[PDB]
Amino acid sequence: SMSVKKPKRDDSKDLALCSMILTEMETHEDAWPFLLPVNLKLVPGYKKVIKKPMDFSTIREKLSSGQYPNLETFALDVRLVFDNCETFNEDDSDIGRAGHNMRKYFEKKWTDTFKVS
Numbered sequence: 001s002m003s004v005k006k007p008k009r010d011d012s013k014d015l016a017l018c019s020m021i022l023t024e025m026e027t028h029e030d031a032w033p034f035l036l037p038v039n040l041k042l043v044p045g046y047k048k049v050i051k052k053p054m055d056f057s058t059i060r061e062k063l064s065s066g067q068y069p070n071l072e073t074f075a076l077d078v079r080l081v082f083d084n085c086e087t088f089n090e091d092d093s094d095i096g097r098a099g100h101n102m103r104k105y106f107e108k109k110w111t112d113t114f115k116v117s
Protein backbone atom coordinates (compact mmCIF):
# COMPACT_ATOMS: atom_id res chain seq x y z
CA SER A 1 0.00 0.00 0.00
CA MET A 2 0.95 3.70 0.14
CA SER A 3 4.64 4.07 1.12
CA VAL A 4 4.82 0.33 1.90
CA LYS A 5 6.82 -1.27 -0.88
CA LYS A 6 6.58 -4.95 -1.59
CA PRO A 7 9.77 -6.69 -2.69
CA LYS A 8 9.75 -7.28 -6.48
CA ARG A 9 11.70 -9.57 -8.77
CA ASP A 10 14.45 -8.19 -10.98
CA ASP A 11 12.79 -7.80 -14.43
CA SER A 12 15.81 -6.24 -16.22
CA LYS A 13 16.57 -9.40 -18.27
CA ASP A 14 12.93 -10.24 -19.15
CA LEU A 15 13.02 -8.70 -22.67
CA ALA A 16 16.16 -10.57 -23.71
CA LEU A 17 14.93 -13.78 -22.17
CA CYS A 18 11.47 -13.62 -23.88
CA SER A 19 13.20 -12.75 -27.19
CA MET A 20 15.40 -15.87 -26.80
CA ILE A 21 12.36 -18.03 -26.00
CA LEU A 22 10.56 -16.69 -29.07
CA THR A 23 13.58 -17.37 -31.28
CA GLU A 24 13.59 -21.00 -30.04
CA MET A 25 9.89 -21.27 -30.87
CA GLU A 26 10.35 -19.70 -34.34
CA THR A 27 13.10 -22.27 -35.20
CA HIS A 28 11.28 -25.46 -33.89
CA GLU A 29 10.40 -27.90 -36.69
CA ASP A 30 6.76 -27.87 -35.68
CA ALA A 31 6.46 -23.99 -35.73
CA TRP A 32 5.27 -23.93 -39.37
CA PRO A 33 1.58 -23.35 -38.66
CA PHE A 34 2.42 -20.34 -36.39
CA LEU A 35 5.01 -18.29 -38.25
CA LEU A 36 2.49 -15.93 -39.96
CA PRO A 37 -1.05 -14.85 -39.27
CA VAL A 38 -3.65 -17.38 -40.32
CA ASN A 39 -4.65 -16.36 -43.77
CA LEU A 40 -8.10 -14.81 -43.29
CA LYS A 41 -8.87 -14.75 -47.01
CA LEU A 42 -8.15 -18.41 -47.58
CA VAL A 43 -9.33 -19.98 -44.33
CA PRO A 44 -13.14 -20.14 -43.93
CA GLY A 45 -14.46 -19.80 -40.37
CA TYR A 46 -11.31 -18.23 -38.98
CA LYS A 47 -12.16 -14.56 -38.83
CA LYS A 48 -15.64 -15.07 -37.34
CA VAL A 49 -14.71 -17.85 -34.95
CA ILE A 50 -11.27 -16.65 -33.69
CA LYS A 51 -11.83 -13.28 -32.05
CA LYS A 52 -8.19 -12.55 -31.30
CA PRO A 53 -5.86 -14.06 -33.86
CA MET A 54 -2.20 -14.30 -32.82
CA ASP A 55 0.98 -15.73 -34.37
CA PHE A 56 4.77 -15.68 -33.76
CA SER A 57 5.50 -12.86 -36.28
CA THR A 58 2.95 -10.61 -34.61
CA ILE A 59 4.45 -11.46 -31.23
CA ARG A 60 7.93 -10.66 -32.55
CA GLU A 61 6.75 -7.25 -33.91
CA LYS A 62 5.13 -6.47 -30.57
CA LEU A 63 8.18 -7.49 -28.58
CA SER A 64 10.50 -5.44 -30.80
CA SER A 65 8.37 -2.26 -30.52
CA GLY A 66 7.73 -2.10 -26.75
CA GLN A 67 4.16 -3.29 -26.90
CA TYR A 68 4.47 -5.77 -23.99
CA PRO A 69 4.28 -4.02 -20.59
CA ASN A 70 5.67 -7.12 -18.84
CA LEU A 71 6.55 -10.75 -19.21
CA GLU A 72 3.01 -11.98 -18.32
CA THR A 73 1.50 -10.09 -21.23
CA PHE A 74 4.00 -11.83 -23.52
CA ALA A 75 3.12 -15.32 -22.19
CA LEU A 76 -0.59 -14.50 -22.67
CA ASP A 77 -0.05 -13.84 -26.41
CA VAL A 78 2.05 -17.03 -26.78
CA ARG A 79 -0.71 -19.08 -25.06
CA LEU A 80 -3.31 -17.35 -27.19
CA VAL A 81 -1.62 -18.84 -30.28
CA PHE A 82 -2.09 -22.37 -28.92
CA ASP A 83 -5.59 -21.77 -27.50
CA ASN A 84 -6.68 -20.50 -30.96
CA CYS A 85 -5.06 -23.51 -32.55
CA GLU A 86 -7.07 -25.90 -30.31
CA THR A 87 -10.30 -23.99 -30.92
CA PHE A 88 -9.99 -24.26 -34.71
CA ASN A 89 -8.13 -27.51 -35.36
CA GLU A 90 -8.87 -31.18 -34.55
CA ASP A 91 -6.31 -32.64 -32.03
CA ASP A 92 -5.63 -35.33 -34.59
CA SER A 93 -4.65 -32.97 -37.46
CA ASP A 94 -1.00 -32.12 -38.29
CA ILE A 95 -1.65 -28.51 -37.22
CA GLY A 96 -3.43 -29.62 -34.04
CA ARG A 97 -0.56 -31.95 -33.06
CA ALA A 98 1.94 -29.20 -33.86
CA GLY A 99 0.17 -26.88 -31.44
CA HIS A 100 0.14 -29.33 -28.55
CA ASN A 101 3.83 -29.99 -29.09
CA MET A 102 4.72 -26.27 -29.24
CA ARG A 103 2.74 -25.50 -26.15
CA LYS A 104 4.51 -28.21 -24.13
CA TYR A 105 7.77 -26.87 -25.50
CA PHE A 106 6.96 -23.29 -24.52
CA GLU A 107 5.71 -23.97 -21.01
CA LYS A 108 8.87 -25.89 -20.04
CA LYS A 109 11.13 -23.04 -21.30
CA TRP A 110 8.89 -20.61 -19.44
CA THR A 111 9.23 -22.54 -16.14
CA ASP A 112 12.92 -23.14 -16.53
CA THR A 113 13.61 -19.52 -17.39
CA PHE A 114 11.42 -17.60 -14.90
CA LYS A 115 9.45 -19.77 -12.45
CA VAL A 116 11.81 -22.66 -11.54
CA SER A 117 14.70 -20.16 -11.81
Ligand SMILES: CCCOc1ccn2c(C(C)=O)cc(-c3ccccc3S(C)(=O)=O)c2c1
Pocket: 032, 033, 034, 035, 036, 037, 038, 039, 042, 043, 085, 088, 089, 095
Ligand atom coordinates in the same frame (compact mmCIF):
# COMPACT_ATOMS: atom_id res chain seq x y z
C1 LIG B 1 -6.55 -23.15 -47.22
C2 LIG B 1 -6.79 -24.07 -46.01
C3 LIG B 1 -5.71 -23.81 -44.93
O1 LIG B 1 -6.32 -23.84 -43.62
C4 LIG B 1 -5.56 -23.51 -42.52
C5 LIG B 1 -6.22 -23.48 -41.29
C6 LIG B 1 -5.52 -23.18 -40.14
N1 LIG B 1 -4.14 -22.89 -40.28
C7 LIG B 1 -3.27 -22.59 -39.27
C8 LIG B 1 -3.63 -22.48 -37.93
C9 LIG B 1 -2.55 -22.12 -36.92
O2 LIG B 1 -4.80 -22.64 -37.50
C10 LIG B 1 -2.06 -22.40 -39.86
C11 LIG B 1 -2.20 -22.62 -41.22
C12 LIG B 1 -1.20 -22.62 -42.15
C13 LIG B 1 -0.63 -23.86 -42.48
C14 LIG B 1 0.43 -24.00 -43.38
C15 LIG B 1 0.99 -22.88 -43.99
C16 LIG B 1 0.44 -21.65 -43.68
C17 LIG B 1 -0.62 -21.50 -42.79
S1 LIG B 1 -1.17 -19.85 -42.48
C18 LIG B 1 -0.51 -19.33 -40.91
O3 LIG B 1 -0.53 -19.08 -43.60
O4 LIG B 1 -2.63 -19.79 -42.54
C19 LIG B 1 -3.49 -22.91 -41.46
C20 LIG B 1 -4.17 -23.22 -42.58
